[PDB]
Amino acid sequence: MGDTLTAGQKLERGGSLQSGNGAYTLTLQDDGNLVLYARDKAVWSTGTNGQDVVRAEVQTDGNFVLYTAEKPVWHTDTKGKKEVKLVLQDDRNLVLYAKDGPAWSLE
Amino acid sequence: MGDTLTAGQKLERGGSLQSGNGAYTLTLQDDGNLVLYARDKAVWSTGTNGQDVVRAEVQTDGNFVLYTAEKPVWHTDTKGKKEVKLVLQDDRNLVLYAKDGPAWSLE
Numbered sequence: 408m409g410d411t412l413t414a415g416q417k418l419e420r421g422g423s424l425q426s427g428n429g430a431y432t433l434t435l436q437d438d439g440n441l442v443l444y445a446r447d448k449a450v451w452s453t454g455t456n457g458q459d460v461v462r463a464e465v466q467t468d469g470n471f472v473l474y475t476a477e478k479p480v481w482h483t484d485t486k487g488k489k490e491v492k493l494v495l496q497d498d499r500n501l502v503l504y505a506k507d508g509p510a511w512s513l514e
Numbered sequence: 515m516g517d518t519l520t521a522g523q524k525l526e527r528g529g530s531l532q533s534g535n536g537a538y539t540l541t542l543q544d545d546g547n548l549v550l551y552a553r554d555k556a557v558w559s560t561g562t563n564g565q566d567v568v569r570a571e572v573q574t575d576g577n578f579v580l581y582t583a584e585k586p587v588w589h590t591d592t593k594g595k596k597e598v599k600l601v602l603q604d605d606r607n608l609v610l611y612a613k614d615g616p617a618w619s620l621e
């Protein structure tokens with residue numbers, strides 16, 4: 408745990424920065440907030456708690472930024488289906504075949 | 515120009531699938547909607563228009579999912595600054611030093 412992020416480096420969930428003397432810790436938490444702690448007492452934060460923040464990156468173009476991960480907005484909900492292939496057939500039916508057979512079709 | 519998305523594959527902004535007979539087109543659009551067309555007639559949609567959907571992936575586990583891209587929620591706003599580094603100091607101040615001095619801090 409060092410005290411510097413160079414252009415290209417990023418803090419991820421859990422990952423943090425420690426000051427030289429080891430008094431101050433800037434830590435990107437899993438709650439989505441980048442907090443600064445002075446001996447177990449939060450003194451500043453980004454105020455992004457309750458958000459899906461995955462990385463806090465010092466970019467090349469020259470700005471520190473916190474990004475949300477890619478959020479799922481629509482899914483067929485067929486987790487764990489083996490060897491899946493989506494096919495658009497000539498019968499105007501979009502189907503999602505699996506190892507056992509059709510897992511999802513709009514029909 | 516194809517009719518199949520095997521495990522791992524995805525549709526990317528603007529990309530599309532085409533049925534064997536060439537009557538039907540599934541296309542992830544720029545506006546965000548995954549829509550199936552019957553030559554100018556939208557027969558089926560995900561209703562994800564308006565959202566920042568970047569890919570529509572047939573995942574390895576089995577689940578076909580649409581994802582909205584990573585969105586910045588907090589930033590320092592110093593784009594255009596050259597050679598930047600974030601530093602948590604012993605005086606407690608967190609500073610983003612640029613090639614021409616401190617670009618952002620707490621003071």
Ligand SMILES: CO[C@H]1O[C@H](CO)[C@@H](O)[C@H](O)[C@@H]1O
Pocket residue numbers: 479482484485486573575577579
């Ligand atoms: C909760 O787990 C399921 O949903 C997420 C996102 O919706 C997928 O990434 C994952 O593979 C599963 O299908």
Ligand SMILES: CO[C@H]1O[C@H](CO)[C@@H](O)[C@H](O)[C@@H]1O
Pocket residue numbers: 543545547549556558559563
């Ligand atoms: C409201 O319209 C939106 O959705 C339809 C599909 O229903 C598309 O044809 C159209 O380009 C837009 O994305």
Ligand SMILES: CO[C@H]1O[C@H](CO)[C@@H](O)[C@H](O)[C@@H]1O
Pocket residue numbers: 603605607609616618619620621
């Ligand atoms: C007031 O001085 C402090 O704050 C400035 C921000 O302008 C830092 O650059 C500097 O190193 C000190 O920590």
